[PDB]
Structures are given as structure tokens and as C-alpha cells.
Amino acid sequence: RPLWFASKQSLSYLDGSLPGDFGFDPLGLSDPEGTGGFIEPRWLAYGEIINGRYAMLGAVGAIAPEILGKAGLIPQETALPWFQTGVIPPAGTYNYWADPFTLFVFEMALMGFAEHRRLQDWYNPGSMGKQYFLGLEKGFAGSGEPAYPGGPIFNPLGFGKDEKSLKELKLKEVKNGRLAMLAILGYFIQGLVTGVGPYQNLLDHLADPVNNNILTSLKFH
Amino acid sequence: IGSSTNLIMVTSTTLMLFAGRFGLAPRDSGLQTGDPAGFTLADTLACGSFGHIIGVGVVLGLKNIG
Amino acid sequence: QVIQPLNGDPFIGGLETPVTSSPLIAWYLSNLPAYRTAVNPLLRGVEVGLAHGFLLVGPFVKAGPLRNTEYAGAAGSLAAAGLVVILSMCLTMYGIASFKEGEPSIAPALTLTGRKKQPDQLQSADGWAKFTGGFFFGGVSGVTWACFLMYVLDLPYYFK
Amino acid sequence: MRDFKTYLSVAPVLSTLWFGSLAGLLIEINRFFPDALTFPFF
Amino acid sequence: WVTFYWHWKHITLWQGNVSQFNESSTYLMGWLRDYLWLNSSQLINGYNPFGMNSLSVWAWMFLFGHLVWATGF
Amino acid sequence: EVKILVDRDPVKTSFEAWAKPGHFSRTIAKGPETTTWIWNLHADAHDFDSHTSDLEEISRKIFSAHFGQLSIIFLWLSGMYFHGARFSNYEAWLSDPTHIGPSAQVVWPIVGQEILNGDVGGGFRGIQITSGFFQIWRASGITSELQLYCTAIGALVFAALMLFAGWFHYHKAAPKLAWFQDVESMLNHHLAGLLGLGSLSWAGHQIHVSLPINQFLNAGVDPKEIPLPHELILNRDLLAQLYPSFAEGATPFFTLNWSKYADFLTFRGGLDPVTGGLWLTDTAHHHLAIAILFLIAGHMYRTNWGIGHGLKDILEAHKGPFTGQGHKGLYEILTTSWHAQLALNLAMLGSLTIVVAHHMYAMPPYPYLATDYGTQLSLFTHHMWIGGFLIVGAAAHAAIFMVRDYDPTTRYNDLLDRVLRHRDAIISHLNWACIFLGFHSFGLYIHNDTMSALGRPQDMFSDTAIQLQPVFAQWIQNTHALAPSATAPGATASTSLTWGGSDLVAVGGKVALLPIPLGTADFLVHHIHAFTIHVTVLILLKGVLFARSSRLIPDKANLGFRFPCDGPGRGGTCQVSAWDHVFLGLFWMYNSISVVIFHFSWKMQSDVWGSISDQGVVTHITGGNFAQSSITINGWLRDFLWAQASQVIQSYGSSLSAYGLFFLGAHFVWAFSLMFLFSGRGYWQELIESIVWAHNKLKVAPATQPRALSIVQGRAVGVTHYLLGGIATTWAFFLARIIAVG
């Protein structure tokens, strides 16, 4: 098994069972001794998976409108950098069909449902197949593993029926997730330093490599 | 760049890393790496940070002196 | 190990320190008149009185109520002599309070090494009486000598 | 709930509630009937 | 208390200023200010950096009494 | 090995322990048999070392109590920010700081108390505050009440977070003992992450927000027309107009061309002539350098990676011939005793508070702080009192360590043993030093009083008489006055205006700071200070050293840390405990701090504070009478107490009448303390017997049998009321005097 910056303490609990395990834990945050709160190794892996999935959504969602505007696919007024779409009102605001606080309330309610349900699956496995919820609860029974519930709603195409295929797909998911959250951190830092958007940063790097670097950007903007 | 500051900082960092690697300069351990002397990432960061501190001080002193 | 127990004894209320048992400090203390056991207490009293009466004149002359007048040299010096007349008096009372006529000296008869030593005659009625008389004589002599040096012979001085 | 009501029945909490109610009553009386030196109702 | 009352009433009567006692003895700040603070000016000014007068002995005994009152504490 | 060791759900959250008083210990949970139990219930409430013998539960209770204290502090800060947002004249004070008195509290119109709403200025009626929050907010760049409201809401949220964390880290996820004993990681995080990162973030705030807003304010721009602090972040050119180096970005930092940042990072020194405070660029550079020093000072101690230092090895490496084994064994003492850590931290924090008060009076760091005489006096006096209390508590808990946590069978230290072996020499030498200092410091005052009373002013210890000049302090002042010339050529001006020179800063016709002269009076007062400090040290150190045993009571440690006596035997063994030594040292700390604050008040009123005429002359508040009057006790009684009490005894009928009422009430409480201090329990118990008979005659006697207060509790009540009265007296007197005339 390949190991990247593995430690003697880290190898005492990282035995390769979890997907994407390379022994990397210099700080020992997943140590199973004195474990409580949110520092549980299962909770840490679950949070890594959820953060990776959300960042795989976000790293494409924060760069797709800019690419579509450059390609002239759908109108350029909706083609803005990710900080110019009302996320940061000083950076830019777009006039949607609703006030940003009203949209925040709508999002908060919908995700409160869709995420407190997930939290109660984590607390009590299989508890969302019991109570009546619009008749959809039959698809919310889960599989005993909170990060990978499966079922006809979350796994409709039936991908990875085989165990080796499931393990390979889990490894692919965690690796692409880690890359995506690295990309999201890069988006944030490039917005803080340059402030022109990540796709514009890529275009400036492609047009000239020497004049547009991390080194020739410390002047900020 | 290649200026005096670049040369001083590169020399200080390289000298501190060499002193921490080969020289005597460096119950709670566990980090492992591939180099044979056990010069882990923590030792690399420590030597680089100390060399950076020394080089920054030397540069800012020589700038005032001339 | 610099701080030792007092003469190798850890159960005596004291300690041996470089301020206590240095050879130079022990020599200096042993050569003081108060610790000269084999000498007549009259001579040691004379020396002690001379030193103390000599050193007492300065504060009285320089800080007295008449320090800025012509009578600074005499009256303050007289005050110093008066203090000696007080001090010896106190000593005399001590000599009557502590020591009796019929008792011998109460001074220790041993040394640090534990060898037999003749006790000091100072801790006795006759010895302390002789010491007090010598102290009075030395005190008045020292006050007179200080007055003679500063104001009668007119030796040059900084006078503080 | 019984334990919380027992805690509310302990000496400092009950004294605080009673004296706060009394102080509020006296303050409101002094607002509505201020500067009272005599009893003039009779 | 008895001698404070006597001295203040008589020292306001002798000055022909009994209104000061009649208006200031009903509250303790009047006792502190118009009796203790007001009547002690010449007492504490018995000796100053500018000289001294015949009340210097009373100032010295005043401070002596304060000191020996505080020493028993 | 340094991991997060936490056990889940150790204590059940329930109100069952709320319903039972005194649940923490056994002798108290049995129920009250007498009234004394009630007092005991408020005496052992926070003594976690007596409730249980396990260090883990004690440490968890300590951690959650610290969280609750932080929540209370955040609640108090939210209250101050709210009362500065509403019920305040901060916006009015911003326009005219030199003529409008700060105010953040208004009283309600009931029972005639609305007279306390004084005309502070700015179209506002309310209580004038002296906490100096307005100066902090101006130094922070706050120019609106909405910002104060937002800060209050954030502090309320932070208080709720602290309370939730305190509940969570005891009832849900409690740290283990080894988590608390990881002192190396704690020191690293508190030096690099708490102090270093906090200083770096505050330097960033000062550079990006406080500097441009304060530049606009000092330029005469109206506060409502000043650009918002976020506008100077989004627009770098707006900040670049004031400081052109911002046009270069962070490249001068990364290329080590730090001298390009010499427009907002200056080593100027002195005070700002416009505001009378320290330059904010100086504070920004100071906090930046402090952050760098703390961040490189936080990577010292060893952790999971082999680099770093071991505290145990560092301590064990220092041992000399005089001290024998040296500092070996101190690590195990300090890592297994909370009382030793409390003693050390209390002493250090009290000394830090004292030096904070001195350095704030000497260098006002906020705009329009020096010219606010009430704020300066209140801050100095308050932090003096806080420092004295913490220093007393240091010895108070060192005694608890010696009684309870000290044992030589295990956790034996050679240094502590050698200290305890020669304790008689230490106490006797300090006794002689106290006697010598008392004589040659207070007998000089007595001598001056007698010479002045006898009509012999030429025989006193005055400037126009026998002179005791502080040559060393004057030489230090002269050296620090010429520091920019030779020793510190990079500083434009001196570190303060209180050394010397022709410099003088005056804002709005009031003197901010002056070169403070030092003479015979300062000499006498400073040696009085040394005498009082040495006596307090003597009392506290004697209690700490003899808390275990002495020649009188060889088994005093078995009697406990806090016991009344050992009977009338051996001639009387009253107040032999170390608690009584703390109780005695409280009075002496009170005396020392009272003399210190009296010295500060009179010296700054006579030689520093005052008014500047248009011609150029300076007239002080008391006319510079400290040099000739403060050398005698009669001068302190007349020209300081009697003369300056006229502003607090004549405050009736005005807005300062609350200070007169507090003056009288504090005198009353101070007198009331003498009843507990001078009496004894037996007489009060015998009187309570007759009162109990009177109640029993009418069938109204209680089941809880009334008992007189215990001996230790009587002493505690006496000293508490004594300190409260004697401190509130000075509080009211200082506040009324410095608000009416300053």
C-alpha cells in the first residue's frame, strides 16, 4: 500500500480499510483513543466524503458560468465570477426573482429537511424508512453505512454492484473529492489575491506564463 | 531574482538545512520518511524556518549597514 | 556543597554559609576585641569604647540642631560624650542584671573542634564591670580625640 | 420539572423573586403617587 | 455624639448663626461638612510651609491622636 | 502522544443536583442543622480540591468554570457596547472630544434620581463614565452606533458560545487528565496562536482600518462623511492616497524591502500632538513585531515531532552548588497542582496589571485619553487595585499548595526544601528590612512634621532644606531623555514625555503630559512605597513558609490551611493559619495601594495636569504644592484630603451627589467592619441565646438553630467590609474631585 507522509502513530489505526487511505495523519486527528464529539474517525471520514462531494459540485459550479459566457452559450449577464453572483454583495450582486435573504430562507428550509434527515440517519441508522414521509421513506432506508446509503433514490442506476467495483468507485470518489476541495481552496485564494475569477486567472496564465504567476501577483488588487 | 538578498537567503537556508541534516544540530516521535538519516518533514520545516529567520535578520542588518 | 550544617550538626538552629564560616570572616571576627578571650576585658572595652566614641561624634556634629552655627564642633561632640555616659550606664545595668558576684564565667568552655578552652572572663561580674569601665574611658577619649582632630588641631577634612 | 420547581423554591431564588416583585410594586407606587410625606386620604 | 452635638450647637449659637445648625444637622453630610470639615481649617493650618502659629501644638496633638488611634487597630 | 483524550458523556445534565443544596461534599449534603451550614455552602462551593481527590474531575470543573467566566466577560462587554450604542453620546463626543464628557449610562426618572443625569455635553444628559471606552472605540475606528450594536450582538453570540462550550466540555465531551497535563502544546498554542496570532490580527485591523479612519478624523473630516472601513479594503487606492506604500502591495514584504513600509510602520515615539495619544502607526508596528516575536517564541517546546524543547529537561539542566539538585522535580509539582499554577499566574498577572497601569499613565495609547483626567485616574487606580488583589491571592494559593499539595515523599523538590530549611533567616532579615524601611521612611515624615510644628523649617527634609535627591531616578530620566540621540538613533522622539526636555503636548487647552520632576518628596514617597511593599511581602511570605509547621505548632499542616486557632495555649495561638496571614496582608496591600494612588493623584494634579493659556503659561490644578506640602503628614491631611474633599462633600444637589452618598456609605461600611474585626464569636452567641429565648417564648424560633458567625468567617466579613468601604471612599472622592475640576 502506498503511503504519503505516513507516521508510526498514523499507521496504528489507518489499516487501509477506509477508501483513499494512504496513512496521512501527521496531527493524529483520527486517533481512536480518547475519542468523542466530532473527532470520531467515522465522523471525520463521513465529513471528508460530504465535503468532497460538495466541493466536486462547487468547483464546476463556480467556473461553468464563466466558461459559458466566454463561449457565448447562455447570456453574459448571468455569466459572472462566483463572488459576483450575490454571494458577496460588495463584490457584486445579481437581481434574481427573489431577495437574497428570501433565497437564503428557502435554501435553509430545504436543506434543513434534506440534511436533518441525513443527520438522523447518522444518529439512528435505518430510522428514515419507518416514519411516513410522502411515501418516499421506502427509498430512505439506507445500507448501514451513512456515507454510502445507496437505494433506488441515491443509487438509481445501480452502479458498483460488485464489491471490487464499489471499492474502486469509492477510491475514485474520495480522490476526485480531495482534488475538488483543493481546487475550491485555490478558487478562494485566487479570488483573495487577484479578484478576477479563476477562469480569467487560467486565461491570463495561458496567454503568458511568466507575467502571470503566483510570484507576480503579490501586489494584490 | 539573483540579487544580494536572494543569495543571502538561499545560502542561509541551505546552510541551516545542511547543519540539521549532517551536523549535530536537529520520546515523542513517529513521523517517517524515505531519506536514510530520518530527516523528516518536521526537521526540514524547522531548519528552513530558522534559516529564514537568520537570513531575514542578516539581510535587514546588511541593508542598514550597507 | 557550599552550605553545610552548623559544625556538622543538622539539628542545631543554624547553618554554615560563606557569610558565616569563611576563613577570612572567622579571622576578622576572632581578631575583634569582643572575641579576644585570653585578653583583659579592660583593654577590649577600651578599644570598643574608642572606636564607638570616635564614630559617634560625626552624626551629632553634622546633623545636630546647631550644625550650621559656630557651636557645631563643641555641643554636638558633647552630645556624643553624653551618649557614652548613657551607653556605659546601660552596660553597667546589664552587668548588674546578668552576672552575680559569687558565680564564675558563663562563657562556653569549648571550641568548634571540641577541645577544652578557658572560658571568657567577659561573661562575669568583674569582667563585665572592667569592660564597662574601659568602654566609658575609651568613649570619652575617642570623643575628645575626634573633637581635637576636627576642630582643635584643625586637620583638613571633607566633613561629609 | 419537579426538581426545577424545587430549585425555584430554594431560599435565594424565591427571595429574589419576592423582593423583585416588591421592589417593582414600590417603584410603580412611587411613580403613580410621588413625593408622599403624609397620608391625606382621611 | 453627645459632645459633637453640644459643640456644634454652641459654636453655631456663639457666632449668631443657629440657622446653619438648624438646617444642616438633619443629615449626616451636614455634620461631616459644616462641622468637621469647616471648623478644622485653622486647626490643620497650625503649621504649614509658610510658617506656624499658636495652634501648631493642637495640630500636632491632632495628628498624634490620629496616629495612636490607628495604632491600637 | 499529545492527542485529544476526551471521554463522552461523563456527567448527566439534570436538575436533581439543583434541587439539593451542597451536593458537592458529604458533610454538607446531609442537610442544615444550624445556620452555619448556609455560610459553609457558600464557602466550599468552588473548592473542587476538597470535593473529590481525583485530578481529572477537578480539572474538568476548572475548565468549565473558566468557560463560564469567559461567558460572563463577553456578556459584560456586550453590555458596554450596547450602552455605548444606545444611551450614549459617542457620536457627539467624536466631533468635540475636548469639550464633551463621555457618558454611557442614563438613570430613569424615579424618586428624584434624575438629578444624576448631568449636562455632560453634546445634547445629552446622563452619567459621565470614566472607563475610557470612547477612546478605545475611536482608536478602533468606530464612527457609528450601528458598529457598536453589531459588536454587542457579536459579544452576546460569543457569550452564548462560551456557555455552550462550558456545558459541552463537562457534560458531553470532557477532556482527560493527560490532555490538561500537555503543558508544552498548551504553551506553544498560547504563545503562537493566542498571543501571536491575536497581535497579528490586531495589527492587521490597525493597519487596514484604524489608521485611515483615524487619519481622516485627525484631518478634521466629519465622522459621518468618512469612508466606511470596508471601503478602504475593497479600494486599495483609497488607502494608498494616505499611505503610498500600499500601491506596492505585499511585494516589499516578500522581497524584504520592509523600509518601503516606513509610512504606516514608524518608530516615532512620543505622543500625537493632534490627539495627545500614541501614534497609531507606532502601535501597528509594535503589534506586528510582538506578533512575530510571539510566533517564533511559540515553536520552542516539544510535541509529537522530535524537534523542540522539553520543560522537564530544561528545568533539570539548571542546578548549582548552592542549590544542590536544583530545579529537578518542579515539573511534576507544577503539572499535578492547580494551586501552584494559580499562585504563579496570580503573581504574574498582578505585576502585569501594575505595570500596565504605570505604562498607560506614562504613555496614553488612545486619542484624547491623557486630556481626560478622570479616565486616567480611574484606570490607574483600578488596575493598581486589581494588581494588588491578584498579588495577595498568589500567596493565598501558594499557602494552599504548601498545606495540601506539598509532600516530600513523592514530588520532592530540592529548592523548596532548602527554602523551608532556612525560613527563619529569610523572615528575620525581611523583618529587619521592614523595620529599617519604616523608620528611615516614616520617621522622616514625623521629623518634618515636628520641625515644621516647632518653627524650624530649615531642619526638615525639604528641597529648601536637607535634601534627599533621587540621583539614580533623575539619571535614568536624563538617560531616557537623550535616548534618540545616541542609544536609539532610529527613534525620532523619546519613549515618553515624562523624562525631560522642552517637549510638551497640550490638546484643547489641557496639558496631556509634562516632564515630571523628581525631588525629596518623591524620594520619601517612593521609600514609603518600598516599606509598605516589603511589609506585605513579609506577611505573605511568612504565611506561605510557616503554613505547615513552626516552633509553636509543629503540626499546623494537620490543622488545615484555614483554621481559626489552636486554643489559648502557648500563651495564645490566635491567627496562626496562613489564611489569617492572607487576611492580615489584605490590609497592608490596601494601605500600600492607597498610598500609591494618593501619590499619583497629588503628583499629577500638581505637576502634570492643568491648563494651557493662549500666551503659553501652564497653571496646574493644585498649583504645584506637592514639593513643599507632601513631605509632612499634615500636608497630606490638609492640602490633599481636606482641600480636595470639598468637591465630594459639596456635590449634594448636583449630578455628582451619588459620589457624596457613596462617600458617606463607604465611611459607614468601613466603620461597620470594625464590629466584626474587633469582637469575638462568644459574646454574639451568648446574645443570640437571649434572642432565641425571646423567639421561643412566642413559638416563633426556627428549626435551623441560629449561630454566630465562625471566627474565620468573622475575620473574612470584617476584612471584606473594610476593603469595600476603604476602597469605595477613595473611589467616590477621586471621581467627584476629578470630574468636578477636570
Ligand code: CLA
Ligand atoms: C474536509 C476535511 C478533510 C477531512 C475531514 C479528512 C479526513 C480524513 N483524511 Mg483526508 N484529505 C483532505 C481533506 C480532509 N480529509 C485533503 C484536502 C486531502 C488532499 C491534500 C486529503 C488527503 C488524505 C490522505 C492522503 C489521507 C487522508 C486521510 C484522512 C483521515 C485521517 C486524517 C484526519 O483525521 O483528518 C481530519 C481533518 C480535518 C478535521 C480537516 C480540517 C483541518 C484544518 C482545520 C484545516 C485548515 C486548512 C485550510 C486549508 C486553511 C484555512 C484557509 C481558508 C480560510 C481559506 C480522515 C478520514 C488518511 C486516510 O486514511 O484516508 C481515509 C490519509 O492517508 N486524507
Ligand code: CLA
Ligand atoms: C491556538 C489555539 C488556542 C487558543 C486560541 C487558546 C486560547 C485560550 N485557551 Mg487554550 N489550549 C490550547 C490551544 C488554544 N488555546 C490547547 C491545544 C490546549 C490543550 C493542551 C489548551 C488548554 C487550555 C486550557 C486547559 C484552558 C485554556 C484556556 C484558554 C483561554 C484563556 C485565555 C483567555 O481567555 O484569553 C481570552 C481569549 C479569547 C476570547 C480570544 C478568542 C479565542 C477563541 C474564542 C477561542 C477558540 C480557540 C479554540 C482552541 C479553537 C476552537 C475549537 C473548535 C472545536 C471550535 C483562551 C480562550 C483557559 C480557559 O479560559 O478555558 C475556557 C483554560 O482553562 N486552554
Ligand code: CLA
Ligand atoms: C518562574 C517562571 C515562570 C513564570 C514567570 C510563569 C508565568 C506564567 N505562566 Mg507558567 N509555567 C512555568 C513557569 C513559569 N510560569 C513552568 C516551569 C511550566 C511548566 C509546568 C509552566 C506552565 C505554564 C503553562 C502551560 C501556561 C503558563 C502560563 C503562564 C502565564 C499565565 C497567564 C495568566 O496570567 O493568565 C491569563 C490567561 C491565560 C492566557 C491563561 C489560561 C489559564 C491556563 C491555560 C491554565 C494553567 C493550566 C496548567 C497547565 C495547570 C494544569 C494542571 C495539571 C497538571 C492537572 C504566567 C505569566 C500560561 C501562558 O502561556 O499564557 C500565555 C499557560 O498557558 N505556564
Ligand code: CLA
Ligand atoms: C483568579 C481567580 C482565582 C481563583 C480561580 C481562585 C480560586 C479559589 N480560591 Mg482564591 N483568591 C484569589 C483569586 C482566585 N482564587 C484572590 C485574588 C484572592 C485574594 C482576595 C484569593 C484568596 C483566597 C482565599 C482567602 C481563599 C481562597 C480560596 C479559593 C478556593 C475556593 C473559593 C471559594 O470557595 O469562594 C466561593 C465564593 C465566595 C465565598 C464569594 C465571596 C464574596 C466576595 C468575598 C465578595 C466580593 C465583593 C463584591 C465585589 C462587592 C459587591 C457587593 C455585594 C452586595 C454584591 C478556590 C480554589 C479559599 C480556599 O481554598 O479555602 C480552603 C480561601 O480560603 N482564595
Ligand code: CLA
Ligand atoms: C497606624 C499605625 C500603625 C503603626 C505605627 C504600626 C507599626 C508597625 N507595624 Mg502594624 N498594623 C497596623 C497599624 C500600625 N502598625 C494595623 C492597622 C494592622 C492591621 C493589619 C497592623 C498589623 C501589622 C502587621 C501584620 C505587621 C505590622 C508591622 C509593623 C511594624 C513595622 C514597621 C516598622 O517597624 O518600622 C519602624 C516603626 C514604625 C514606623 C512605627 C512608628 C515609629 C516612629 C517612626 C518613631 C517613634 C519615635 C521613637 C521610637 C521615640 C519614642 C519616644 C519615647 C518617649 C518612647 C511596626 C511596629 C509589620 C512587622 O512586624 O514588621 C517588622 C508586620 O508584619 N503591623
Ligand SMILES: CC1=C(/C=C/C(C)=C/C=C/C(C)=C/C=C/C=C(C)/C=C/C=C(C)/C=C/C2=C(C)CCCC2(C)C)C(C)(C)CCC1
Ligand atoms: C528531495 C531531497 C533532496 C533535497 C531537498 C531539498 C533541497 C529541500 C529544500 C527544502 C526547502 C527549500 C525548505 C524550505 C523551508 C522553508 C521554510 C519552512 C520557511 C519558513 C519561513 C518562515 C518561518 C518565515 C518567518 C518570518 C516571516 C513570516 C516574517 C517575519 C520574519 C520571519 C523571518 C520570522 C536531496 C537532494 C537533499 C536528497 C534527496 C531528497
Ligand code: SF4
Ligand atoms: S480568642 Fe478565639 S481565636 Fe483566640 S485562641 Fe480563643 S478561640 Fe482561638
